[PDB]
Amino acid sequence: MHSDLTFCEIILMEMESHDAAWPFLEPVNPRLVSGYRRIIKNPMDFSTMRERLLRGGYTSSEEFAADALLVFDNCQTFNEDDSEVGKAGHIMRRFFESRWEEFY
Ligand SMILES: Cn1cc(CCn2cnc(-c3cnn(C)c3)c2-c2ccc(C#N)cc2)cn1
Known part of the structure; x- marks a missing residue:
């Protein structure tokens, strides 16, 4: 589990710092985007994953992956x-897929 939870931190930090991560750093603000709420x-x-992963609320590596695919x-x-x-x-x-297979 500790090996698992360590890889998620490697993966999310690499995602947080990726050149193409600019649409995913903070929640979509529905006030600014027509139809998003609906x-x-x-x-x-x-950021929501990063809070949850810090606070420790990921039971398994597959709960983390589920949030990524969402x-x-x-x-x-x-x-x-x-x-x-x-x-x-x-x-x-x-x-995410390419690097997630680099461990599982
Ligand atoms: C935080 N905010 C910014 C906006 C306006 C720009 N804009 C329009 N569409 C999206 C969008 C739709 N889907 N996705 C995953 C992103 C965004 C946007 C851009 C950057 C971030 C960050 N970090 C978040 C959203 C609305 N909300």
Whole structure:
């Protein structure tokens, strides 16, 4: 478990600092984005994961991964694949998948 929870910190810090992470650093502010409140049932972003991971609220490495994939599904649900946010999210999702397999 400790080996697992350590890899998540390596992964999230690399995601937090990735060039394409700029759409995921703080929660989407629905005041600024038409339709986001209606379309996305369960928001998630890197800061929410970082709080939860610090406070220690990830039982398993698979709970963490679930939160990561929820970020990118929300992104694909709300943003077109050729939008600025969309393009960035594909890079981040492919980065997460590629590096997550580098341990599991
Ligand atoms: C925090 N805020 C900023 C905005 C306006 C810009 N904007 C429009 N669309 C998105 C968006 C939609 N989906 N995703 C994953 C991001 C954003 C945006 C840009 C950067 C961040 C950060 N960090 C968060 C959101 C709205 N909220």
